[PDB]
Design a protein around this nucleic acid. Structure first.
Lengths: 298, 109, 494, 212, 289
DNA sequence: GTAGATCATGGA
């Protein structure tokens, strides 16, 4: 019986210049693209968040094959032959070998590759991006080149969607450290020197279910640019009321709980029978208890 | 047209009628000479509108000017709407509308 | 008999590059048939039957001999060492455009020294406006297109291969080998006929130079290359379009946006009112990743679909806006592009208003009024574009209102200042532009605009359109109003 | 005959890279039949790709997705050393935002029972009996599927952008993909016609067959 | 363990022009942009605060690689090769040598975000003019100023420091910040903190970024935000890891049911020096200094 | 004798 954990997490409001694009003159372009209603939102690549989770796992013991050398700013491999049974990194994020690209099958016999048990979509800004730049002239009378640069930033919240096949894990107990990393995400790659943007969640909609599909990918939206209210999307509530997305499988926490409770008719709403906790730690503890009971981790 | 647009246009007409009344009063006051100035009156009105620095001063000046205008039939027809619009709206927006009314004013031929 | 190579536009396994290659082969075959009327003259008695959308090749004897003859005659090098494609009418084209095409091919297709042997750096001084400018280009002695016939045929039997041929990025643009450690296996493979088509690709596609306006033209010459790859509807149509594009001057191929190049490829097209015009093309951007980059890299591919209205508007823009200037310095011809034309062409291609990004691309990104000064030179084009606007006449009414207000504001000071003390329009317009740039949000900009309108004195246009202009000012976003104020300043007639 | 299974599909982000687009990540406007076939095989948990040859798929676009480019530090096998700087290259990848489409699955030409249509219907009927690994995605592994559900011919009852097999069409989508090179990749030319039909036309059906 | 010092610091009320950007003609525009609920706020760049911290480290006598010449207004490097082991500035703020043995870059322990005005920017401007009837093109000018308090968010990765003891000078500099780059001649705005919310925890998550709000859109009130208070009440933020100091302490203590709230058992000090001393004692105990 | 690794090879 497969067990999947899907989740949409919303980040705190702040000034962000996280992912960036190819530079153009003095401007470091924030990377962006179209989203709902055709407006342009700033993106954060999925590889960025996967790198953040990898670094979280590396930073707290958790023997990993791909070790990030902080001194040399390079990535190193402890073992050339990836071993998902031993390394958290290979078990969760998967790997691809040289022979994986010159053959059609997945074996060549040691496995040729491994599809990562965790997949996360890219993070998008909850609010459409308006052109905002910052001056960067460096101190000193000697005004040569490499000075007077422009940095694009975005003062909104970011939301992203992730999903894990917990059954696909070689070691079932490895899902708990990943959840801890998702909540205690250190830093998603970006200009932390100038724009320190904590990526820790402040609103969650998790779903622990055996269904291969979860219609909760991007449930947070408020639009109305230059704001931070971040209400739950109407279509998500409508899908909850319709009958799909069983409320008993939903886990809602963070600051959205206050807005959900303040809604009228919420006591009789089908969304009421979902596991709703204002405290994210309490909801995560309850969800991890359920996960350990279901996966036999006890 | 939305209701907000309707009230905005009614306010523009109210201000234009008030300027008509004030300029007629001036014309009656300075009938002497070749012709009473018209551009100078508009410049005076613009300077006095720009003099206002806060909500209270601007709204006091606007009410005084509106009363000096006279009958102001468009205000006769729309007591509550225009009164609430003046009381509620930020004074900067009302000044913008007043200056738009000044710019879009046609002196009587 | 039975054609040894058969190529059709209707084949379901072909991509856009394959069809462009068949078009190039069609043009080359037409030119060769004009050059060699009798099949006996051609090596191997190679003969072809060309239709609107089909190419069939017949030859006798060894396949290698006939293919080698066809390929060697198709791709040639003149005495000076320039790439000489017989598909193009080389006598009709001038030396400068031939050099431009050769440089584009060498910078896009022959990016690698593994596919060309370089000669000496030939320098030629052609007089232009009583000045001799020295063009310096890298002459060639061989390129892979010339000797691909060996790769097309078997080594021993000297016959056309019955299997797939592993091709590289010089044949198919972007057909890179991602993993160099798998060079033998992970390589794009094509049938021999499609390999020949990909060989003939460069004839049809055209090359434009992209100018970045952030850097000054004088301080650095352009290096980004744009490849315009058309979508083929018919062999005859595309052949005629390319041979017509041969008319364009070399200075027209320097653009500041991909959409400009895409529209320029179709600029000479004749519009038939009774025929539904529709054409599409792709523009490929090749740019060095860093300063020390050895070869250009494919960065972006933009798909452009043009209709009758877009083509008509672009033709009007080309006719009325200022053409590309040709600043000539010591042994260099710096071609100064028109930013307004590029911006308008990009806006037309994207399907948005032609004034969509005028402010942040014309005032914010202007160093020393270099872009600002061109507005008064393109005033006539601005007036034409506003007059022939497909919609939104209310904002033209607003243009008239703002121009009247500007007239009043300027006339006030010009009456205050006596003769000699009167400043030119340049200083007042610069101050007005700076004051417009000061505004940061809706409230401040609308306050400033309203005060400016009042200071402009009596405004007949505003009076005649009280409700419309008032609603337009109240409702429209302030950025759009600022852009339209800018282009009303540009088209202001003293 | 049994009505063809209809699978509504909603993906926040999707990248259908082109077969020959290796230097830059150019994407197809519409999911190719090969990608949809692979997604369905993943949905039913079928690792063997030759198992369900002969299934016919029809794709109807509920909206025109917008194309965007994102920079990416993608890795490659260029040097033997993993830590060598040559193994990381920056290049653009084109993505599609808010892709909504309806997929018709018809399995009349399959010679192995149970057919793919029956397997998908059974998987949706009893999701707890599906044996599969990983998370369902369309395109890249990180581009998860938001909503995949059984729908009717009129789920949005609006207007549909069908993918019609036209020999003069622009798109060249593959119904079979060779991931090593391009020898075994098989192509077909399509066009996107704006039609108000609630059922796929005859030319909108593509059969997934082996290159042999 | 991995310890982080997160903190949101609020400045005093005053007139500020510290963040000029590219000027538009005559008037000097200060950097601004959209913020909470769609109004325009003035931002002070985080590089300004980083420069101020660097100058504090230099003035206090600590070994700093990049020495700033006050009389020459130029920057000089004592060692061309950056050595985070020896120099405080290289260890703390990192470096990046970009030119054609030792590493060429460092991530830097200190991470700072932009300083944001608590109050939306009204649009105040000030006219300046050179005295004298001999007037030229550079006679009169305009400078934009803002009467507000600036708040900014910073984070320190203590374990990332090459020398763990270097975190204390950074805290001292934060509490004794020198002039933050601006117009000190005519708008002397002290950037020393007057309200702090610090968090010294081993968990990576922080919920204190920009936790201050205004009672009135144009006022010097600076109350704590309701979201931060709610997150303290619900138990998300551990009160034992919370350090609140400054003038916000009075407003917190006047809150109703304060003695029963979990916010009560947090480290609350009216005197900022006492709060800093207690926090530094805790930090020294935790890091084994 | 052949595949993997290594090295050359490119300007105005």
């Amino acid at each position: 019986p497969n067990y999947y954990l899907y989740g949409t997490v919303l980040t705190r409001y702040g000034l962000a210049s996280l992912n960036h694009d190819i530079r153009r003159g003095n401007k470091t372009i924030l990377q962006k693209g179209y989203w709902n209603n055709g407006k342009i939102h700033s993106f954060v690549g999925s590889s960025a968040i996967r790198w953040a989770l990898r670094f979280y796992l590396q930073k707290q013991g958790y023997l990993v094959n791909r070790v990030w050398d902080e001194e040399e700013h390079i990535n190193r491999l402890t073992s050339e032959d990836f071993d998902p049974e031993k390394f958290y990194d290979d078990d969760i994020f998967g790997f691809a070998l040289l022979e994986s690209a010159e053959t059609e099958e997945d074996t060549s016999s040691t496995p040729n590759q491994r599809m990562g048990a965790l997949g996360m979509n890219m993070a998008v800004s909850l609010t459409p991006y308006d052109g905002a730049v910052k001056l960067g002239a460096k101190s000193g009378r000697e005004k040569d080149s490499t000075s007077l640069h422009f940095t694009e930033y975005h003062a909104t919240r970011y939301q992203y969607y992730f999903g894990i096949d917990a059954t696909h894990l070689k070691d079932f107990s490895r899902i708990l450290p990943m959840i801890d990393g998702i909540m205690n995400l250190p830093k998603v790659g970006g200009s932390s020197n100038i724009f320190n943007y904590p990526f820790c969640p402040d609103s969650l909609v998790f779903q622990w279910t055996n269904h291969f599909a979860s219609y909760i990918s991007y449930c947070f939206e408020y639009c109305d640019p230059k704001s931070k209210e971040a209400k739950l999307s109407q279509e998500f509530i409508d899908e909850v009321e319709c009958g799909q997305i069983d409320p008993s499988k939903l886990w809602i926490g963070g600051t959205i709980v206050k807005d959900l409770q303040q809604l009228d008719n919420f006591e009789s709403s089908p969304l009421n029978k979902a596991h709703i906790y204002r405290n994210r730690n309490e909801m995560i503890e309850a969800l991890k208890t359920v996960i350990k009971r279901d996966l036999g981790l006890e | 047209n939305s209701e907000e647009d309707k009230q905005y246009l009614i306010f523009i007409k109210v201000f234009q009628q008030a300027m008509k009344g004030n300029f007629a009063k001036i014309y009656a006051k300075t009938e002497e000479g070749k012709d009473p100035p018209i551009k100078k009156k508009v410049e005076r009105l613009r300077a006095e509108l720009n003099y206002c620095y806060d909500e209270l001063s601007f709204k006091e000046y606007l009410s005084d000017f509106l009363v000096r205008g006279g009958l102001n039939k468009y205000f006769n027809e729309h007591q509550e709407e225009i009164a609430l619009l003046i009381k509620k709206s930020p004074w900067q927006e009302i000044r913008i509308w007043s200056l738009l009314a000044i710019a879009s004013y046609k002196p009587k031929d | 008999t039975q054609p040894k190579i058969s190529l059709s536009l209707h084949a379901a396994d072909t991509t856009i590059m394959h069809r462009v290659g068949m078009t190039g082969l069609y043009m080359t075959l037409k030119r060769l048939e004009k050059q060699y009327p009798l099949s006996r003259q051609r090596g191997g008695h190679i003969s072809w039957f060309l239709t609107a959308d089909t190419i069939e090749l017949f030859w006798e004897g060894s396949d290698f001999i006939a293919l080698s003859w066809l390929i060697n005659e198709s791709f040639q090098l003149d005495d000076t060492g320039l790439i000489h494609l017989v598909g193009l009418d080389n006598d009709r084209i001038d030396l400068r455009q031939k050099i431009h095409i050769h440089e584009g091919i060498c910078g896009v297709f022959l990016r690698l020294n593994k596919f060309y042997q370089a000669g000496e750096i030939i320098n030629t001084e052609l007089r232009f406006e009583e000045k001799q400018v020295e063009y310096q280009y890298k002459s060639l002695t061989w390129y892979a297109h010339q000797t691909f016939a060996e790769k097309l045929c078997e080594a021993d039997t000297q016959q056309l291969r019955h299997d797939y041929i592993q091709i590289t990025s010089w044949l198919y643009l972007g057909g890179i080998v991602r993993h160099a450690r798998t060079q033998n296996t992970t390589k794009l493979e094509e049938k021999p006929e499609y390999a020949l088509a990909l060989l003939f690709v460069p004839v049809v596609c055209h090359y434009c130079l992209l100018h970045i306006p952030s850097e000054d033209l004088k301080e650095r010459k352009p290096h980004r290359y744009l490849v315009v790859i058309p979508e083929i509807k018919d062999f005859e149509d595309a052949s005629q379009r390319r041979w017509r594009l041969q008319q364009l001057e070399t200075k027209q191929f320097h653009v500041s946006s991909l959409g400009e190049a895409g529209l320029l490829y179709y600029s000479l097209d004749d519009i038939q009112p009774e025929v539904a015009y529709y054409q599409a093309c792709q523009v490929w951007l090749y740019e060095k990743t860093n300063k020390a980059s050895r070869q250009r890299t494919l960065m972006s591919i933009e798909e452009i679909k043009i209709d009758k209205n877009i083509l008509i508007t672009y033709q009007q823009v080309q006719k009325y806006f200022k053409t590309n200037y040709q600043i000539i310095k010591y042994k260099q011809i710096f071609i100064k592009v028109n930013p307004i034309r590029s911006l308008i062409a990009d806006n037309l291609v994207k399907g948005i208003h032609w004034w969509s990004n005028f402010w942040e691309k014309l005032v914010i990104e202007d160093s020393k009024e270099y872009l600002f000064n061109q507005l008064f030179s393109n005033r006539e084009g601005f007036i034409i574009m506003a007059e022939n606007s497909e919609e939104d006449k209310q904002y033209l009414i607003f243009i008239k209102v703002f121009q009247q207000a500007m007239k009043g504001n300027f006339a006030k000071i010009y009456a205050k200042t006596e003769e000699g003390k009167d400043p030119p329009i340049k200083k007042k317009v610069e101050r007005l532009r700076a004051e417009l740039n000061y505004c940061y949000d809706e409230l401040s900009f609308k306050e400033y605009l309203s005060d400016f309108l009042v200071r402009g004195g009596l405004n007949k246009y505003f009076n005649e359109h009280q409700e419309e202009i008032a609603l337009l000012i109240k409702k429209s976003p302030w950025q759009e109003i600022r852009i339209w104020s800018l282009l009303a300043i540009a088209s202001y007639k003293p | 005959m049994i009505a063809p299974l209809i699978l509504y599909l909603d993906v926040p982000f999707t990248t259908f890279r082109e077969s020959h687009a290796r230097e830059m990540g150019k994407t197809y406007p519409v999911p190719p039949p090969a990608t949809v076939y692979g997604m369905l095989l993943s949905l039913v948990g079928e690792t063997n790709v030759y198992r369900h040859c002969g299934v016919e798929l029809a794709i109807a676009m509920l909206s025109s997705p917008k194309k965007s480019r994102i920079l990416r530090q993608m890795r490659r096998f260029k040097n033997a050393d993993f830590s060598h700087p040559e193994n990381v290259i920056p290049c653009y990848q084109e993505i599609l935002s808010n892709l909504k489409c309806l997929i018709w699955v018809r399995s009349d030409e399959e010679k192995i029972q149970p057919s793919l249509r029956e397997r998908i219907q059974l998987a949706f009927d009893h999701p707890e009996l599906v044996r599969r690994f990983g998370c369902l995605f369309l395109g890249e592994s990180d581009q998860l599927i938001k909503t995949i559900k059984l729908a009717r011919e009129d789920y949005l009852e609006g207007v549909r952008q069908w993918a019609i097999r036209d020999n003069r069409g622009r798109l060249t989508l593959p119904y079979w993909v060779d991931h090593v090179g391009s020898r075994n990749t098989r192509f077909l030319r399509y066009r996107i016609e704006e039609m108000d039909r609630l059922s796929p036309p005859d030319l909108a059906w593509t059969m997934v067959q082996s290159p042999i």
